[PDB]
Design a protein around this ligand. Sequence first.
Ligand code: OAA
Lengths: 435, 435, 434
Amino acid sequence: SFLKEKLAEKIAQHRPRTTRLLSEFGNVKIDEVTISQAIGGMRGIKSLVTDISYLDPEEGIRFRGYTIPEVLEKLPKVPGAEMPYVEGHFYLLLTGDVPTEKEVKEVAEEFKKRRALPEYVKDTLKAMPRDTHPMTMFAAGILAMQRESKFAAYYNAGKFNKNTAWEPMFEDAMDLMARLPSLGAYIYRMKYKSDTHIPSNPDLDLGGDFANMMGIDKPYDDVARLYFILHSDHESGNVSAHTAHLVASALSDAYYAYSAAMCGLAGPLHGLANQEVLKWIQETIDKKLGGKVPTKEELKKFVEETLSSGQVIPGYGHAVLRKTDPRYVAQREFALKHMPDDPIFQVVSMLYEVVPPILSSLGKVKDPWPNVDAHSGCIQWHYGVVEYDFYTVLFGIGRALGVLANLVWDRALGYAIERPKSVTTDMLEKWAGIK
Amino acid sequence: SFLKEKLAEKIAQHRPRTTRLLSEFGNVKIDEVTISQAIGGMRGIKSLVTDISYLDPEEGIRFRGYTIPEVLEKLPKVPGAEMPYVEGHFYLLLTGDVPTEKEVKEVAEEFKKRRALPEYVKDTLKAMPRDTHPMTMFAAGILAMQRESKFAAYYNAGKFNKNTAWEPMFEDAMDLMARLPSLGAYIYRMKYKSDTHIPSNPDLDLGGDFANMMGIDKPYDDVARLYFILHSDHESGNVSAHTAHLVASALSDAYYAYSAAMCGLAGPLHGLANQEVLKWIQETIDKKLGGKVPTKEELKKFVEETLSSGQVIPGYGHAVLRKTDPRYVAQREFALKHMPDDPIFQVVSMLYEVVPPILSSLGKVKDPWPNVDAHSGCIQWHYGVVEYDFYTVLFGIGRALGVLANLVWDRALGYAIERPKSVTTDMLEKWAGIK
Amino acid sequence: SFLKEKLAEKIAQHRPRTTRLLSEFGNVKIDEVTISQAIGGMRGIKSLVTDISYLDPEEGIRFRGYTIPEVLEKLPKVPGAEMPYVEGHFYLLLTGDVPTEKEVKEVAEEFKKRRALPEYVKDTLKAMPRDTHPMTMFAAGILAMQRESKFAAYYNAGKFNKNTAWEPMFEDAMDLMARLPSLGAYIYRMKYKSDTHIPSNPDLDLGGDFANMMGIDKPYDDVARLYFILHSDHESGNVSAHTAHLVASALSDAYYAYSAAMCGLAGPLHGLANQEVLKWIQETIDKKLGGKVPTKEELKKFVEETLSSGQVIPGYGHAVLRKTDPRYVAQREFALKHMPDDPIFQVVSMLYEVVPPILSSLGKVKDPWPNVDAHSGCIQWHYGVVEYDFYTVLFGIGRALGVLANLVWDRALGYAIERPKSVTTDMLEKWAGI
Ligand SMILES: O=C([O-])CC(=O)C(=O)O
């Protein structure tokens, strides 16, 4: 039972559905476009297809039909530790199936042999000024390893075949996913930990070895495992996942595609929310609460003034999520058990109480509820990841699991180039009756 | 006169129009989306807004409402050369106005002072293996300079505001546009010309200095002014312009945005058609045509043999264009004028006569006509730019002209994060009634 | 056809709206259900949805937003005649758009080629005893023709698709509507006019050909076009429209649905009032007015005798109307023009004046006002349609317009099987506290 073989089977079962949908039901209508939506970032238009994950606006994110709680129970657990192998979650995103112990082990052995970082990636990151933002460094590392692309080599030797193209894409995906934790770790060490490095430990799994290379003791190994599974995918319309998909649709390899994707995740409106919550809180705990865990009342009215004055409670909104986020939920369950007393956690817990009441009552706030990055930071800070800018790197490692899975499938199914049609301000004006 | 102040003026007049389309005419339907389109990468969906350029299927591209012939006619010319200052085209894309001679001079002077490459860019490209692909190097060079982003510093200093965000965007666009030719030339010299560098001549325009730094004599300066102007923009739905737009919509700076864009342009379905066309012609001449420019009738039968056996004619057709590309036309006039007796151009000319009737009869191709990529290669090769992989880097340099103008406007008008909605196969199958 | 794709166009726009209400606001309360209403036939419960027409208690019926005056006014008229093509009304009911002259003409051509009666319908009707009530013959004729159902043929060959199911429903609607007047007219000749049959004239409009085949001269053509439009629909909760809806909600075809429709319309409390009115007027005229148009006074006193004897003035009252029926209004307009001097009409007219005041001030009848069943009879009798039982067949042909339009949408919008919940008397007694 091997991943690539099983993946071939699933691809063989899935192709006729796609073919059918095109041949028999091509012109069936699924949505409309308004002036509002064209000007406003295609907001809400159903115009992309993925099966890796689906984001219900009411129910949370599902990974291959499963729920977060389901995924966390079903995936084989790392022995002597509490969370699943991340490699098992990748097996699941790739195939649709929960892996057995036996199947996880095989992927994890595969990751161990693909995990080493090319020495020239380090050369490049050293030549880039050390004051460069970690996400720029992370994107660069990815880009430089485009030299190693099996998909690019396949294409340039003239081997392109629409049926087999997924095979080198799968190879590139396994290689890149194996290496991202090492690349992130290297960036962490070189910028923030005095440029001393802890070697990869061949016996550890992906998340375990990330914790190791980061230089953080148990239970950070589980913090990482959980964090990456949680950030693994949020369907394909988020900017990072979409950016990867889009670039890849031109048959650019994954190195190009995921580098481009990290350029999107770097954006303040996409990858910064975890840290901005945490800085908001700390500052609140500082100025507005005399350096101390407050009480329910105090917090209740703190919100109201911040609201009344044209300010937003951070990490309590979202463009697609309309209910509470179950990624948020899994973080808590972890916090409640591992750091119940941590001062910062106590404030994110209490915030859970009041702020839904106030936005529900104030009105509007189409999403009057917490998204994941309302929680992620307090866990990181607890364990001594204080370097805020780096948080987005952790996001990038995680999000690759679903995006690279997605890229394999884009190629398996021959999804065509993404090339919408532009219109001018004048054209919109016509269609609106203006003159 | 001054570019920044005129740009301000144009923004302050445009902003109410967008406002109005949103405020009054928001839910006006402009298009619909079918199952075919979700699966077929959004083909045809009118879901993006730009005023920089507009791609008309029949007429091709208009830059700020001007046709290619009237752009080349109206833009101020470099003294002692045939072609316009690329800096003038840039002014036109930013403002909508055709600049006076005085107005281009001050854009040329501004670029002269923003032209120099950060030394660490050269350090970075040297650390990257020398056998790395030139587009990988080009993307990397761009990305490394994200360190200088005024937009990023502005955001990180807490200065973000929807009225002023265009300003540091413009500064970053000006900085980066000024340097892109030097970045490309550095890559050309370091890879292909023995790693000897020709210094910038502070007395040349962008086009002339690019030929200087490449080490190519007149009239390659004109080849470059024309090439870059023709490749400047193809509205915003093309993968590279779209990638930059999408990434910048999360408030990622132009460096992140344009590095991402070049990752998409790297793609064989986006940035390779030039070299692939040229290789095809040269191979065809060698094997099928006994190393000689054929007669009309000999080439008509080679085309049909090729079309009958399951092949395609490279550089013909397009996902949007439905008639002859006016970019192809402008390249032809240059070729006719400058290299009539060139063997490769001859085949290109004859192809232009022979191929459209044959493709039209068969009605396989929806655009049975050439695009620019049918023509660019023979001109490059004629002046001794024989390094096929580098052709795309020339594209990158040109395309930044419209894409960076576009990011400035995106920020001016406050266009929101791009976040369309994904649906699964199961969901398409439900909508199709095959639940 | 231009009709079929105009309709495809409306459906594709209207479906997201329906999904939205389901998907987002599906738990929003719309009304409540009291023991009274459960016992008394769902009286006043807002449990059905339709867009073909809406019945306002006060203003009465609107067809696709439009009132009766407006509909009569806007619909293309027949050359040489007063009234609209009924085809025109069908288009409007289907599409929602008032039709151009060309649009009306395309429906009329479509009906002219769909108009011919299967010979086995005639065989079946001849085998039914000639003394069978015309509504039974009517419902049987419809039912027999479910052999031709395209919608059924499409179900049986595995081709059902929730997106495409409206399309064969539409074909059947067009096939059946095109035939209903011919079926009606065959029943009329075979029973009442010596079993001799005037052929269909393929140059005539639906209503003109009906009168042609019935054997009645102008202006019976206009009587019919008017009659059919006015009876076209009365939203979906009336027993005939509801029966068809209910039956088709189980994905029975329109032949099954409308046959069932006509079984309900057959009922004394739904399709008989027109005739029961006209008889009672005839009686009264003969055995209470010395066979002559009374004075206003003579008749104001007659209404009270009858009432205070525990009798009802038929053709007045309604379970939903609460003011005067605009259907009644329109019939009256026609009468005043064409038959002012008719004795029976003159009593209908007088009645119009004296009955509401009495009924109002008695405070008993919740609709102290006429409905259309108060008027239709005098018109039919005036032109020599004396055969009382057959009136309800006229209603059937009429009411198909709106109901078959409605079934196309039911399938278009994919409405589920109508299946409410039953409760015992005991349970009602428990929710009463006994
Ligand atoms: O609406 C009702 O319940 C009865 C009626 O008047 C009609 O069917 O036209």
